[PDB]
């Protein structure tokens, strides 16, 4: 019975590893977007003010 419960625990941990791998790939993609958003805000909104 302990051997069966340990197999179910192994499967739950395996599902969580898959969720974490997918989450870290998404987070890496989101950091890249946030870098481009900050640069674009500086170019479109801040840099024009000295001429006015």
């Amino acid at each position: 019975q302990n051997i069966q419960e340990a197999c179910l625990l192994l499967d739950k941990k395996q599902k969580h590893i898959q969720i974490l791998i997918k989450g870290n790939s998404s987070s890496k993609s989101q950091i890249r977007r946030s870098s481009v958003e900050a640069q674009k805000y500086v170019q479109d909104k801040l840099l024009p003010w000295p001429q006015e």
């Binding site: 909104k45 801040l46 003010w49 006015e52």
Partner: protein, 50 residues
């Protein structure tokens, strides 16, 4: 940074617009001391007409 720069431009612009309105007022020919008297009597000058 954007919000503070916007306040400074708004204040400079309001001061600029109010200056241009005052300069246009102060340039009215009716306020100028050097207005040579008109040779013709103004139609509003009822006493000179009478």
């Amino acid at each position: 940074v954007y919000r503070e720069l916007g306040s400074i431009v708004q204040e400079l612009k309001e001061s600029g617009d109010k200056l241009e309105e005052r300069l246009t007022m102060l340039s009215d020919v009716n306020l100028l001391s050097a207005s040579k008297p008109r040779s013709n009597i103004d139609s509003k000058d009822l006493t000179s007409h009478r």
